Amino acid sequence: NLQEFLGGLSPGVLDRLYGHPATCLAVFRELPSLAKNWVMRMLFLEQPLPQAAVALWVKKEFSKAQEESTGLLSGLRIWHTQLLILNPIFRQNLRIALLGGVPSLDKYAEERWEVVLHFMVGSPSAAVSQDLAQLLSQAGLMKSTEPGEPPCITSAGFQFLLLDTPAQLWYFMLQYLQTAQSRGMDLVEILSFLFQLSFSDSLLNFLQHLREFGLVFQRKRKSRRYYPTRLAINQPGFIVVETNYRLYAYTESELQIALIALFSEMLYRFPNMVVAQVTRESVQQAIASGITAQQIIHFLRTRAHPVMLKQTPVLPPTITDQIRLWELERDRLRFTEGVLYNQFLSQVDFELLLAHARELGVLVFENSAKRLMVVTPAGHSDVKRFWKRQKHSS
Amino acid sequence: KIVAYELKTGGVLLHPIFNPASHLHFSIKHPHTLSWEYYSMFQCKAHLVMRLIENRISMEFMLQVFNKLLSLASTASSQKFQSHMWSQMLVSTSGFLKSISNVSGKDIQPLIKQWVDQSGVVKFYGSFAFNRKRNVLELEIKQDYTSPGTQKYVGPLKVTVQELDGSFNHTLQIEENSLKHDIPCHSKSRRNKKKKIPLMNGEEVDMDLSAMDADSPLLWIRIDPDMSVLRKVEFEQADFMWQYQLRYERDVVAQQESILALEKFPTPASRLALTDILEQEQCFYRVRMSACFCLAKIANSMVSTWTGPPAMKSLFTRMFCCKSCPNIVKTNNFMSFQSYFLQKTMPVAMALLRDVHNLCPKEVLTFILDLIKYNDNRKNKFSDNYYRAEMID
């Protein structure tokens, strides 16, 4: 979440990131419940106040909200104890932020994201962009290993594909920022633009990437002014599930049919409907590719036709249980590397050796009834020496 | 006795050749320059080497050798010729070996060269490992031949392995460069069904196999069981193997060496093993007399773990006191000669008990004083002087 992203930052980057135009407001909106008011309170104070007052300024009931808010805002470093006055820079910027100092767009965003997902999947026809391809490859959801051949899809790719559009886009942008730092694009400058949206060379490239993702559209041959789409700031279902593992999806966009075929066997494709079967073969194929039953169940639930919404639960228990059981049947046997000594003789002497391999992290399984211990070959040169020392001690 | 003396100072040299032994502070050319401890160990080593010659050449041939010597001497003893024939009454080494070679057809010259002419004993350090994959027992026997009293053994060596299918003997060839000896192991199908495990003799017993390893069939190993060399063995078994060897063996020297090796394992299973040995008539009495002192040492080592009364006290009141009065000892009847020896050796070991404060407990001292007060000897046909002397001890 954005709270996690901002918490994972240093004070030096934080105070700089607290830009005048929007950041002080975007980070304010994050404040879940109460930190809004206390910050507002001490927006006009130039004198720090004792911590005991803040501690006692919440009733005995619902105090956990007080501690959690205080910890969150301490991590954000909005104030300093100074002994709890807010940061002067944040105070000034917040005062400046508080009385101081479309139908085609959404369709465009939808179409651009749909073509992006088409390229993500093995679609023969898709938008071509080397920068987008390499960005997705380095995002960790795609690996090529051969420039001539089109890149394939990794295990994480299917999991990302089956996610809902909001979380999908949010995670994609999180990876975009993380890779922006790696490629050298300043993180603060690009981050501030996202906050400003909800109200330089690097800026131009970042805006180009956002437009490629479909969040923004200049509409004027790449002019300075931009009109963000709905997705920039941050629908009814169509699948009907039977009790015989049959899916009837009212899908016209090929993306939905591809997503369903990822974990189901397609039977018929009507102009406004498609019939598929959720069989062991398809489900286990998806599980081997990397998906887990949770993503499939969530996908079917979110894309649930209104007809089946009346019944509770929406997804039939038999279908859900069958999918879960199919995923569970996937793993049984294991693999590890180890070495076994034996003849530990004295009972109280074997108990001391068990703590040597457990602290170093080379112990797999033990046995106090037969005096047997398995030691991995990675730490064999350290356990033997200890045993020798013990023998010398006698 | 001899391995202690030979590792202490040099070695005893039977049949020297005229100095032949310069590791020791007197000359062995004459009997009147020998130390008295050397004379005692000389006679001791001589009769053990004769037992070794009986081991190589069987006992009936040995008695035939002795009868041939005596018969030559008694035909010599009746002549009147002044020593033309009276020197057949004098034996030598060459004449003894020639008479052995006459009666048996085998000569013992390697055994004579090793244990008579060479003056040393051997030291064996053994450790085993059971290979579960190939079902073999990999022994590892190394000798300490650089000590002052020792020598190097290169002959064959008997080893006796008790597995679940029975007791099997194996002969190992221990050359100078040898270290690992792989012997084969049998099944473990007497743990699938409860059947009795057959022993070294023809009998078979019920064993509690809960302490045994699940993967190994072998219950105990004994390196050189018949004492066929002049040796000191230091074998590294597991403590349950020593307890099985103490309980179910039909050899007293193996029970004694398991008592001697159980002092290093003070676990309560070893206390149960020695207590079951102590309670057991039809055990040899000198094994139970050793188990008293071993139980005292183990009890001293597991203080702040010991649950009930002091060691052997309840066992003494169960074996030798009245049923109606536990602290009054029975009146002395010493006609059994094995519970007499055990009765007079059990408080002597019981007095070596110590508390957490390193002082003998006042429960054992009071018990010994009540053994002294309530002693009545007006009824047995035997005297009480050794039992009372052991009470003072």
UniProtKB/Swiss-Prot annotation, chain A:
What is the organism field in this record? Homo sapiens (Human)
Q: Which family does it belong to?
A: Belongs to the TFB2 family.
Identify the InterPro entries for this entry: Tfb2_C, TFIIH_p52/Tfb2
Which locations, inside or outside the cell, does it occupy? Answer: Nucleus
- Pfam families, alphabetized: Tfb2, Tfb2_C
In the record, biological process GO terms are:
DNA repair; nucleotide-excision repair; transcription by RNA polymerase II
Keyword terms: DNA damage, DNA repair, Nucleus, Transcription, Transcription regulation
Quaternary state and partners of this protein? Component of the 7-subunit TFIIH core complex composed of XPB/ERCC3, XPD/ERCC2, GTF2H1, GTF2H2, GTF2H3, GTF2H4 and GTF2H5, which is active in NER. The core complex associates with the 3-subunit CDK-activating kinase (CAK) module composed of CCNH/cyclin H, CDK7 and MNAT1 to form the 10-subunit holoenzyme (holo-TFIIH) active in transcription.
Which comment does the entry carry about domains?
The C-terminus (residues 305-462) stimulates the ATPase activity of XPB/ERCC3.
- Sum up the protein's function in the record's words: Component of the general transcription and DNA repair factor IIH (TFIIH) core complex, which is involved in general and transcription-coupled nucleotide excision repair (NER) of damaged DNA and, when complexed to CAK, in RNA transcription by RNA polymerase II. In NER, TFIIH acts by opening DNA around the lesion to allow the excision of the damaged oligonucleotide and its replacement by a new DNA fragment. In transcription, TFIIH has an essential role in transcription initiation.
Q: What is this protein called?
A: General transcription factor IIH subunit 4
**Gene Ontology CC terms:** core TFIIH complex portion of holo TFIIH complex; nuclear speck; nucleoplasm; nucleus; transcription factor TFIID complex; transcription factor TFIIH core complex; transcription factor TFIIH holo complex
From the broadest rank down, the organism's phylogenetic lineage runs: Eukaryota, Metazoa, Chordata, Craniata, Vertebrata
Q: Which residues form the signal peptide?
A: none
Which GO terms fall under molecular function for this chain's record? Answer: ATPase activator activity; double-stranded DNA binding; RNA polymerase II general transcription initiation factor activity
Record's NCBIfam families?
tfb2
Which coarse location class applies to the principal site listed for this UniProt protein?
Answer: nucleus
Using the chain's own numbering, where are the disulfide bonds?
none
Curated annotation (Swiss-Prot), chain B:
Taxonomically, the superkingdom here is: Eukaryota
Question: Changing residue 16 to H does what?
Answer: In NEDFCF; uncertain significance
Reported tissue expression: Expressed in all tissues tested.
User: Subcellular localization, per the record?
Assistant: Nucleus
TM annotation in the entry: none
What does the protein in this record do?
The TFIID basal transcription factor complex plays a major role in the initiation of RNA polymerase II (Pol II)-dependent transcription. TFIID recognizes and binds promoters with or without a TATA box via its subunit TBP, a TATA-box-binding protein, and promotes assembly of the pre-initiation complex (PIC). The TFIID complex consists of TBP and TBP-associated factors (TAFs), including TAF1, TAF2, TAF3, TAF4, TAF5, TAF6, TAF7, TAF8, TAF9, TAF10, TAF11, TAF12 and TAF13. TAF2 forms a promoter DNA binding subcomplex of TFIID, together with TAF7 and TAF1.
Q: What else is known?
A: PubMed:9418870 was unable to show an association between TAF2 and TFIID.
Please report which protein family the annotation says this sequence is part of.
Belongs to the TAF2 family.
Which disease does the UniProt record connect it to? Neurodevelopmental disorder with feeding difficulties, thin corpus callosum, and foot deformity: An autosomal recessive disorder characterized by impaired intellectual development, microcephaly, delayed psychomotor development, pyramidal signs, thin corpus callosum, and foot deformity.
Q: How does it assemble?
A: Component of the TFIID basal transcription factor complex, composed of TATA-box-binding protein TBP, and a number of TBP-associated factors (TAFs), including TAF1, TAF2, TAF3, TAF4, TAF5, TAF6, TAF7, TAF8, TAF9, TAF10, TAF11, TAF12 and TAF13. Interacts with TAF2C1. Component of the TFTC-HAT complex.
Supply the name of the protein: Transcription initiation factor TFIID subunit 2
Naturally occurring in which organism (per UniProt): Homo sapiens
